[PDB]
Design an enzyme around this catalytic site. Structure first.
Site, PDB file in Angstrom:
ATOM      1  N   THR A  16      45.032  27.340  62.726  1.00 25.87           N
ATOM      2  CA  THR A  16      44.448  28.486  63.405  1.00 25.87           C
ATOM      3  C   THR A  16      45.448  29.621  63.614  1.00 25.87           C
ATOM      4  O   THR A  16      45.064  30.670  64.141  1.00 25.87           O
ATOM      5  CB  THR A  16      43.869  28.054  64.752  1.00 25.87           C
ATOM      6  OG1 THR A  16      44.849  27.288  65.466  1.00 25.87           O
ATOM      7  CG2 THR A  16      42.607  27.196  64.542  1.00 25.87           C
ATOM      8  N   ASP A  39      41.040  29.640  32.328  1.00 24.28           N
ATOM      9  CA  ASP A  39      42.168  30.566  32.369  1.00 24.28           C
ATOM     10  C   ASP A  39      42.967  30.522  31.059  1.00 24.28           C
ATOM     11  O   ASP A  39      42.373  30.564  29.978  1.00 24.28           O
ATOM     12  CB  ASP A  39      43.047  30.213  33.573  1.00 24.28           C
ATOM     13  CG  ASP A  39      43.946  31.346  33.991  1.00 24.28           C
ATOM     14  OD1 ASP A  39      43.433  32.238  34.690  1.00 24.28           O
ATOM     15  OD2 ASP A  39      45.116  31.409  33.557  1.00 24.28           O
ATOM     16  N   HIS A  69      50.060  31.107  33.698  1.00 24.01           N
ATOM     17  CA  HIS A  69      49.049  31.474  34.688  1.00 24.01           C
ATOM     18  C   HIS A  69      48.086  30.323  34.957  1.00 24.01           C
ATOM     19  O   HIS A  69      47.902  29.903  36.103  1.00 24.01           O
ATOM     20  CB  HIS A  69      48.286  32.705  34.194  1.00 24.01           C
ATOM     21  CG  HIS A  69      47.535  33.427  35.264  1.00 24.01           C
ATOM     22  ND1 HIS A  69      46.284  33.033  35.689  1.00 24.01           N
ATOM     23  CD2 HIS A  69      47.848  34.531  35.981  1.00 24.01           C
ATOM     24  CE1 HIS A  69      45.863  33.856  36.632  1.00 24.01           C
ATOM     25  NE2 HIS A  69      46.792  34.775  36.827  1.00 24.01           N
ATOM     26  N   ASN A 161      43.236  42.883  41.415  1.00 27.98           N
ATOM     27  CA  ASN A 161      44.496  43.368  41.978  1.00 27.98           C
ATOM     28  C   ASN A 161      44.645  44.885  41.851  1.00 27.98           C
ATOM     29  O   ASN A 161      45.732  45.390  41.572  1.00 27.98           O
ATOM     30  CB  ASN A 161      45.694  42.664  41.328  1.00 27.98           C
ATOM     31  CG  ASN A 161      45.482  41.144  41.173  1.00 27.98           C
ATOM     32  OD1 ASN A 161      45.396  40.414  42.164  1.00 27.98           O
ATOM     33  ND2 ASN A 161      45.403  40.673  39.930  1.00 27.98           N
ATOM     34  N   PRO A 175      27.114  38.936  42.983  1.00 35.20           N
ATOM     35  CA  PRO A 175      26.939  38.585  44.407  1.00 35.20           C
ATOM     36  C   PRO A 175      26.764  37.095  44.712  1.00 35.20           C
ATOM     37  O   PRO A 175      27.153  36.654  45.795  1.00 35.20           O
ATOM     38  CB  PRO A 175      25.690  39.379  44.812  1.00 35.20           C
ATOM     39  CG  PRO A 175      24.975  39.679  43.522  1.00 35.20           C
ATOM     40  CD  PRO A 175      26.032  39.800  42.473  1.00 35.20           C
ATOM     41  N   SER A 224      44.335  36.293  41.876  1.00 34.65           N
ATOM     42  CA  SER A 224      44.297  35.100  41.048  1.00 34.65           C
ATOM     43  C   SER A 224      44.940  33.932  41.749  1.00 34.65           C
ATOM     44  O   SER A 224      44.664  32.782  41.392  1.00 34.65           O
ATOM     45  CB  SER A 224      45.002  35.324  39.712  1.00 34.65           C
ATOM     46  OG  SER A 224      44.184  36.124  38.876  1.00 34.65           O
ATOM     47  N   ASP A 260      41.323  37.568  62.016  1.00 39.78           N
ATOM     48  CA  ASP A 260      42.751  37.307  62.127  1.00 39.78           C
ATOM     49  C   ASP A 260      43.599  38.163  61.196  1.00 39.78           C
ATOM     50  O   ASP A 260      44.825  38.189  61.352  1.00 39.78           O
ATOM     51  CB  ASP A 260      43.039  35.829  61.850  1.00 39.78           C
ATOM     52  CG  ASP A 260      42.718  34.939  63.042  1.00 39.78           C
ATOM     53  OD1 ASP A 260      42.794  35.417  64.195  1.00 39.78           O
ATOM     54  OD2 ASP A 260      42.360  33.764  62.822  1.00 39.78           O
TER      55      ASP A 260
END
Length: 279
Positions: A16, A39, A69, A161, A175, A224, A260
């Site tokens: 938390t 990937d 990657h 990014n 969506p 990613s 947060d």
């Protein structure tokens, strides 16, 4: 279970509060689930995968990860030391060449491959797919990601990014799948992270340590790298019987750490992935 001196992102998803370095998780650890990592491929022989990873499909002259990657992402899903689901099965689909790029038609054909290939695998706790890739808007890349989700696979995809709205990117703008932004260790949105109303959740994405090719490790940054944190979490939660593939993104967002993160633009969710484990 407790893993001391874990990577910061693992420790964050079971806390938390930021600033801890121990990862806590139920010892089932994703046993009986499967995650596809679509990937640049996976170095299945890496000692960190313990024989739980293998290549199942490539569109190029080799199914080897000559980039790193795909191996890095697969390590965040389920490697013994850098993984969220330490007992899950990893299935590699190589749709990106060793330079990290691939045609949209190759990426679409990989997604249709997984939607059928899960019928050739044993995954009695469910199926997840982690798509650490993307480009410009494409309605046909979006629809391929919708089909995969609809077939009974939890799809997790990177926001992108570009430090922009993810509406102009695919499959981030689809969506029905689960679009993942990136945060850093001080609970700030990563400076490169896309945003928008299409985003569903945030995961750890800046300076993420994980497996690399040649049997090595390194720390890289990107949406990613937030994506496999959520993908591994979903496989963890489905093993515990807490959710299914169709409602895993919704469940993860309901049980997330709320409010947060900082530097979250207006209209984007302020939710950080959280396993809710009480040791």
């Amino acid at each position: 279970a407790a893993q001391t001196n874990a990577p910061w992102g693992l420790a964050r998803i079971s806390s938390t509060s930021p600033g801890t370095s121990t990862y806590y998780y139920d010892e089932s650890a994703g046993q009986g689930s499967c995650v596809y990592v679509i990937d640049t491929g996976i170095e299945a022989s890496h000692p960190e995968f313990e024989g739980r990873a293998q290549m199942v499909k490539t569109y190029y002259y080799s199914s080897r990860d000559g980039n790193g990657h795909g191996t890095h992402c697969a390590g965040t899903v389920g490697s013994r030391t850098y993984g969220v689901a330490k007992k899950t099965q990893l299935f590699g689909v190589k749709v990106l060449d060793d330079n990290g790029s691939g045609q949209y038609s190759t990426i679409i054909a990989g997604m249709d491959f997984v939607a059928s290939d899960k019928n050739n695998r044993n995954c009695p706790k469910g199926v997840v797919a982690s798509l650490s890739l993307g480009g410009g808007y494409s309605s046909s890349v979006n629809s391929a990601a919708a089909r995969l989700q609809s077939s009974g696979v939890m799809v997790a995809v990177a926001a992108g990014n570009n430090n922009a709205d993810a509406r102009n990117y695919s499959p981030a703008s689809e969506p029905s799948v689960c679009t993942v932004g990136a945060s850093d260790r001080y609970d700030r949105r990563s400076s490169f992270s896309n945003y928008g109303s299409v985003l569903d959740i945030f995961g750890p994405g800046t300076s993420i340590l994980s497996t690399w090719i040649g049997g090595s490790t390194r720390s890289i940054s990107g949406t990613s790298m937030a994506t496999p944190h959520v993908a591994g979490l979903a496989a963890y939660l489905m093993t515990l019987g807490k959710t299914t593939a169709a409602s895993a993104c919704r469940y993860i967002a309901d049980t997330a750490n709320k409010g947060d993160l900082s530097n979250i633009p207006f209209g984007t969710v302020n939710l950080l992935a959280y396993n809710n484990y009480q040791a």
